[PDB]
Amino acid sequence: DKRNAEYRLAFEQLNFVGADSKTPILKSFIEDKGTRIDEITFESMIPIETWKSYIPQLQTSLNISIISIEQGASKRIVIIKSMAGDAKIPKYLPWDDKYIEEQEGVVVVGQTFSGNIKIDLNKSPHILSAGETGSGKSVILRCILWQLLKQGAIAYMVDFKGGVEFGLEYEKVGQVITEVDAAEKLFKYLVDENAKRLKLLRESGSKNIGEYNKKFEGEELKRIIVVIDELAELMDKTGVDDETRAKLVRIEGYTSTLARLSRATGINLCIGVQRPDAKVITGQIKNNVPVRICGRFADSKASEIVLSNTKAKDLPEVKGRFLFKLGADTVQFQAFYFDDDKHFIPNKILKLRK
Numbered sequence: 066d067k068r069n070a071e072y073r074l075a076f077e078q079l080n081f082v083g084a085d086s087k088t089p090i091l092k093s094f095i096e097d098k099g100t101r102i103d104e105i106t107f108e109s110m111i112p113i114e115t116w117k118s119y120i121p122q123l124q125t126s127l128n129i130s131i132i133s134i135e136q137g138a139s140k141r142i143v144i145i146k147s148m149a150g151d152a153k154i155p156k157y158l159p160w161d162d163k164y165i166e167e168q169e170g171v172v173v174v175g176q177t178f179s180g181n182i183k184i185d186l187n188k189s190p191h192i193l194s195a196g197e198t199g200s201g202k203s204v205i206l207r208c209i210l211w212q213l214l215k216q217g218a219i220a221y222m223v224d225f226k227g228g229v230e231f232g233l234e235y236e237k238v239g240q241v242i243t244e245v246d247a248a249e250k251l252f253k254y255l256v257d258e259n260a261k262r263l264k265l266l267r268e269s270g271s272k273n274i275g276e277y278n279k280k281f282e283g284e285e286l287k288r289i290i291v292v293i294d295e296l297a298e299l300m301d302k303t304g305v306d307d308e309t310r311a312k313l314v315r316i317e318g319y320t321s322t323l324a325r326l327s328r329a330t331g332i333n334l335c336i337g338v339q340r341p342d343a344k345v346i347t348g349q350i351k352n353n354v355p356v357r358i359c360g361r362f363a364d365s366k367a368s369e370i371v372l373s374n375t376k377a378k379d380l381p382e383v384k385g386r387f388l389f390k391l392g393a394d395t396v397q398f399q400a401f402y403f404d405d406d407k408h409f410i411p412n413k414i415l416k417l418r419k
């Protein structure tokens with residue numbers, strides 16, 4: 066057993082032995098081939114505090130990035146959460162207009178171990194971005210929005226916090242919705258537009274809008290991008306009056322309809338969530354939004370609501386580091402940093418539209 070031998074040598078070189086004069090014995094090594102976050106279990110007579118003093122050295126000796134070291138079942142077992150030293154992903158990756166894909170509908174959200182995370186909205190039509198305050202889960206949505214705007218999409222932005230998350234500059238490129246009445250009128254219009262698009266597809270014998278657009282020289286349907294800054298603002302009906310609750314009941318239905326039926330019509334939903342709750346990230350939403358982008362959560366319950374797994378509690382504490390899920394994949398990636406002050410240039414969008 067080569068690996069066991071290598072570790073024994075690395076610890077012997079450090080004279081890293083317990084009160085029994087024994088180097089740590091390797092017990093388990095559970096590896097995640099998607100996130101590249103391993104779980105390394107050891108049995109030693111060495112206190113956890115000595116292991117933590119050796120973090121810098123142990124990283125170089127074992128050639129791993131240590132995320133955490135913690136005590137297990139007994140004060141004789143330690144668990145190391147780590148990534149291999151050869152599993153390099155940047156800790157900082159700024160956005161560059163060079164990452165924009167020429168293929169209409171394709172977006173790039175960041176970098177994984179080998180290459181970029183690309184989402185084809187013609188295949189995976191909706192994106193859910195989950196993350197706590199200061200994670201950068203909204204930076205991802207504005208990045209996606211930028212790329213789609215650069216490809217000539219029509220945009221709608223939903224933020225009931227008076228549109229702070231999308232100021233005056235965003236209003237030059239699209240409609241910023243800040244009230245429940247405007248959201249109800251918007252979502253009703255979106256369900257109706259979607260229904261008109263479906264009948265165009267059925268009538269013309271087209272599989273998607275791309276095919277329909279080939280058939281009609283001057284009647285081209287544009288991709289509609291809808292950015293919902295906070296899903297809970299639409300889904301939580303508590304503490305509102307009878308009238309407002311009924312408006313939110315109806316918006317919940319329009320959103321369900323859109324997520325389910327807007328697949329080949331080019332009407333994409335990019336939803337932000339801060340607090341994973343099954344009353345917000347509903348069975349209907351989860352079943353119809355294939356892409357999940359997830360920041361680090363301390364509670365495995367929060368991660369299970371978003372990803373149907375506990376991997377988001379294992380993420381490194383690096384700002385911009387996220388998990389990407391599409392079907393069977395739960396992949397670690399460093400999101401591009403889309404800085405509004407440097408990167409959101411509204412006049413480039415207005416020039417390209419002609």
Ligand SMILES: Nc1ncnc2c1ncn2[C@@H]1O[C@H](COP(=O)(O)OP(=O)(O)OP(O)(O)=S)[C@@H](O)[C@H]1O
Pocket residue numbers: 156157158196197198199200201202203204205384385386399400401402403
């Ligand atoms: N992709 C990223 N790469 C590096 N730093 C990032 C990234 N995203 C955000 N940050 C930083 O982390 C902090 C996040 O704050 P904001 O930029 O306001 O994020 P946001 O996208 O609006 O996210 P929240 O969840 O809604 S506060 C800032 O100090 C950013 O500089």
Ligand SMILES: OC[C@H]1O[C@@H](O)[C@H](O)[C@@H](O)[C@@H]1O
Pocket residue numbers: 177179180181182183184391394396
């Ligand atoms: O869904 C497609 C994506 O799958 C991921 O597993 C890969 O790491 C990405 O590079 C790719 O774009």
Ligand SMILES: OC[C@H]1O[C@@H](O)[C@H](O)[C@@H](O)[C@@H]1O
Pocket residue numbers: 240250251254
């Ligand atoms: O909010 C609904 C309205 O959205 C606008 O962007 C459209 O141009 C209108 O036709 C529509 O009635």
